[PDB]
Amino acid sequence: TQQPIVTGTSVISMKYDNGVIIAADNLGSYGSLLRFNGVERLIPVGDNTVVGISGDISDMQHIERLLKDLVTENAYDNPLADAEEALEPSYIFEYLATVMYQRRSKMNPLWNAIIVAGVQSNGDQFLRYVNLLGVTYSSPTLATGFGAHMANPLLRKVVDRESDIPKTTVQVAEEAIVNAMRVLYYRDARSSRNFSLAIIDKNTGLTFKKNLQVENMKWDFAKDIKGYGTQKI
């Protein structure tokens, strides 16, 4: 892809004492047009990984097909594919990063930003980020697009360093994620009120919540704003 067409906006994610949380809206934007509502931008790989993709939706569907084929080809000649030697978040992220960097070096990038979150087999939280340039990095809080500018401050207020992760319950992290999504819907022009959220825990498993809505909207004060300076009525 040399220019994105149908795109999806920010994808946010954070860590907590027992796993990871990742959210993304359900909108496919055709430029300035909010064309496609209901686009699931969270792709659950297996029962232990979730990939959140922002950017060109065609490349995101290509990534979906590649991940499903990776799962299928891992199941080949692997009697433990449902136990040991199963696809880990680290394996999925490394495959994705290899693909992204090779496409970048081939001058035909995958115009996306990908956040791979999950729980390793040893209970450790995996949460990393890659983009169309092949840049890979990880942090207790990750976000793409506008979320990297607005959602990341609110998420770092909850988890600023690694030591804060064991102190963060799943409720606190989910509340922070929902607050960040609300602020994004406030200030992002290519955003949607409906979104999807996923909580990967080392004790509960893959928790996939669809059709969530941004609530508790503060708009009353808008009735008092009049004019653009000197206007009184």
Binding site: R65, D69, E73, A75, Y76, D77, P79
Partner: protein, 141 residues
């Protein structure tokens, strides 16, 4: 004349390809493998010879999977069976990439049949030494 069984894909005066029949003989010398088509699906079974108790039980899997719905077992030269299974996996992957839907069982059967028949078309390639029982469930049952 004579010597019709020395090269593959050579028609004998009685209208036969003896290399294919020799591959069939190689198949007959292999372990037993069966398949049963029931009402809602299929079942595959195979016998694994324990030449020594040094073989780790439950390992050395003989039944292979193609896509997520195709099961394949084979009797004969196990490596040729693995080769055929890899070819079928490539065919199923291309079919899913192009037509979205998982490959139907008759389509997979015809793909494997065309592959083996092409392998019985040239003297520069040896016929497959396997008989393959495969199947699964598709939109037609």
């Amino acid at each position: 004349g004579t010597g019709y069984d020395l090269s593959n894909s050579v028609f004998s005066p009685d209208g036969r390809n003896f290399q294919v029949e020799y591959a069939v003989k190689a198949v007959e010398n292999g372990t037993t493998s069966i398949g049963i088509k029931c009402n809602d699906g299929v079942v595959f079974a195979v016998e694994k010879l324990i030449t020594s108790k040094l073989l780790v039980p439950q390992k050395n899997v003989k039944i292979q999977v193609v896509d997520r719905h195709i099961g394949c077992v084979y009797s004969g030269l196990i490596p040729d069976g693995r080769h055929l299974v890899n070819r079928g996996r490539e065919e199923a992957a291309s079919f899913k990439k192009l037509y979205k839907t998982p490959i139907p069982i008759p389509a997979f059967a015809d793909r494997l049949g065309q592959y083996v028949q092409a392998h019985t078309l040239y003297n520069s390639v040896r016929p497959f030494g396997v008989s393959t029982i495969f199947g699964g469930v598709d939109k037609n049952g």
